[PDB]
């Protein structure tokens, strides 16, 4: 069947009573849910959906799932199983799943994502947020946004937003339009001009969902599913549309006399990703690096930059360029980076420009004449990566072309560290750390990608190309609620000790792989038998910012505070910028 | 910038002027184009298209193509490059490519595909067809069809069938509606009752194309492209809509406790395709085989057959089922089959059923107790593949379930050939060949997949799992039109002899690979050099149905005609209905 128009309200009511379901076959980023609601209010139409009608004889023939509603990046990213399996004929959605999920999360659910820089262990790193609309939206002529939608905690919404009036979008499914419009009219915090504007935005939102025929679908049973599914694919977007990424790639490879630049680019990606313990770089990175290493004026990942003259330059230099790219990954692996602990792939671009510039080869990793230069790059890269945010995000393209001029100007004197650091300061991307950034670094968690990076900056000396790991000084296994309450730790200090045992003051770098006999002893026990000479012992331990090793867990927080103090100092000096 | 109105005629005028072009980045089956036109006349709407505007300053920055128009499976199957590049702003179509191509082929172009049973080398196996509509179509209740569209020759369109009035669709782009409707009204082929419904169907077809707003699109320049493409993708089918067959795979994987069904399917498929010199088998075949080998009542490739009860039965029997499937591929390779010469992969299903029924293993290929049985299978299979069509196409599912009962009753006595052939006969699929089929077999071309099969039937005794090939008796290279006139062949006959030189009476099976010294000699020279003893030579020529080996090409047709008669007698004997 064809249904040419239903409301979003009718659609979501069916989702609510589990009459629209999913067959057993992910979710969008919050920013994309917001772009959908903005596009919806602006008037962009939905494409048609496709629904498979399940008769009651078949309720049990197949496994069905429920549309995602309250998304939690940690605790609920999988679709929930059906709980109210209908006993009348119902629907499984074959096309429309992600648009319907976003509608459902925005209007009936929530989104809890991990805060930037925090670790999965942290429980206050996943604040629950709900979709909100700023009833006083004004056209942002940069994003093309007409309505400002945003996922907000309850308190960032309720705060006095100056010039803003935030409205929880889901209220239009819970209250009548009259009650909501009256709330806005009766709010004395709005001016009369603001009240008029808030009112027509709230009406526009309410009625887009409740009055406008936005939803169209085909609806078919088992018997003719095959035929209409084919019709549906034929007449709508059947052969999937290229993303912008894949469009640039196709346009870019079109300009190459090599009969398969597509194959050259994939071989390079997979090669790069097999380096060391594995990386995860994309073809986007390779194409942008193409633009950057060929001295193209713009490194913007934009279709206009992949015209035939620029792709002619890129093809000419493809061998130097894939050589530098591949040597960039080998440098990174030689520092200990892999796919799990490299947060910003864009940092590869200036590294690769440098290696490509000086025409370096894999001997750059061994010869001693380079060791000082290799160490200067490592320190710079790690510091850039220790920033929670604000270095390799927004503003990248202008940062990259300025860093490129600095590297160009350096001839073969080596990595131009002072110049680079000044360019970054000039751009609002200083590698200077302020005291609260320092405190944040000193409480990093085991497994956070910045943690090993920080440790290899604080305690250099290992061959980071060889095996090494981060270990707990007081083994993490000793720290459970049961075990601790019997050594006497008060019941209220129990969660404090457990959280602290997993953080930087209890962390160290160790050569080799995980030692299982170290992890079953108290640290003073383990170090007394590995270092019988009491003087060696206290020099080794001191090299690791370990002064003492209390013999009972009851005194762990004394140890923690003491080493936290030493690490704060060591972090300060390590992150202090040189001068001349 | 949106545009919800647009006629198909406007769209195709832009294609015709080369103002709608393709960016550099396959064409549908003719029956899929026909189904597009049927859906279009039934009211199924087109999804919205995405167009990228190229400003005249960038008309040279990228490579563009023209929409395909006159499709030739051999001589013109990849997009035409741009003649007549617009000097004003123009469009590259980013979404809608395939739907526009189909409109363009149906309304302004043509489709030439290889006739079933013929080979690429034959220049009269690709008759040009153009899209036609039966102005007397009536609802077909078996196909959901309402309008019968079909690609036809001018000759088969000019034929009078009881209620078949074929009208060439492209004429609505070339002539005024008045002229076309008057020709229908003036045609003594139609009764007054029929000219009313033919006029109404011609008008509906004409006006769907010229008056109705069926085309809608977004149009964007470089600047808005990224933003609007992502909106387009989010609001429409954003994830590649799953085909019916990918839906079945997903439905099926979901019901397996833990054999990790998705990659056990793909792994078995890859395994199947690497047997011998390689096959090209589909996951769809593997699923169908699951249904047949587990004795499910229906073997229809329909979603209803993949409920959890059936998938439970399949998972239990998965190991014996993949065993049987791989053994069936190994048996086929032992016959000399591969991806190129196996025309009907459905023939695998009864093979695999049989092999699974008797629980045979790899020793079935070698032990001599099976030699007679393997040869009976090979003989039956080849005969089924020697039919140009009508065996493994339509009607397959009922044939399969009946072949299954025949194999199941055969117990352990061996392949039940007589009963299988009775079954095939009552299904209208006799392995009996009539005189005109015999004559067509006696002139198959070199390279036609049926030629190798026929030869292995007529000349058994090689080790078809070791290397062998088809070779010309009088080498193919001797037969160029310059070379032939020089040995003094009359002008009239020259191309009769070139023709016949590529056909079965000049073909033989030889062990090993191509022998380049044999291909440079007249046959009688080759054989006198290889078989110095004239009596062993006559014996060996006799085994290949060679009576005489004329020494001049001038007598080649005397050889052709003599060996053709010898082959006809062998073929008539090899294909004759058997003893009972
Ligand atoms: Cl940027
Ligand atoms: Cl069938």
Author numbering:
A (entry chain B), B (entry chain A): 1 to 25, 29 to 583
Q: What do the study authors state?
A:
Using a suite of thirty environmentally-isolated coliphages, we demonstrate multi-layered and robust phage protection provided by a plasmid-encoded defence island that expresses both a type I BREX system and the novel GmrSD-family type IV DNA modification-dependent restriction enzyme, BrxU.
In order to better understand the biochemical data, the dimeric structure of BrxU was solved to 2.12 Å. The N-terminal DUF262 domain of BrxU is connected to the C-terminal DUF1524 domain by a flexible linker. These linkers entwine in the observed dimer, and then a loop from each N-terminal domain connects with the corresponding protomeric C-terminal domain (bridged by a glycerol molecule in the structure), such that the dimer is, in effect, two interlocked circles. The relative rotation between N- and C-terminal domains is easily observed from a top-down view, and generates a cleft that runs diagonally across the dimer. Within our structure, the position of the γ-phosphate has been taken by a sulphate ion that is bound by R102, and nucleotide binding has been prevented by proximity of an α-helix and linker from the opposing protomer that fill the corresponding space where a nucleotide might bind, also blocking S42 of the RLFDS motif. Within the C-terminal DUF1524 domain, D474 and H475 of the BrxU DHIYP nuclease motif are positioned on the surface of the DUF1524 domain to form part of the cleft wall within BrxU. A glycerol molecule bridges the DUF1524 with a loop extending from the DUF262 domain, and an additional sulphate ion and chloride ion were observed bound by looped regions of DUF1524.
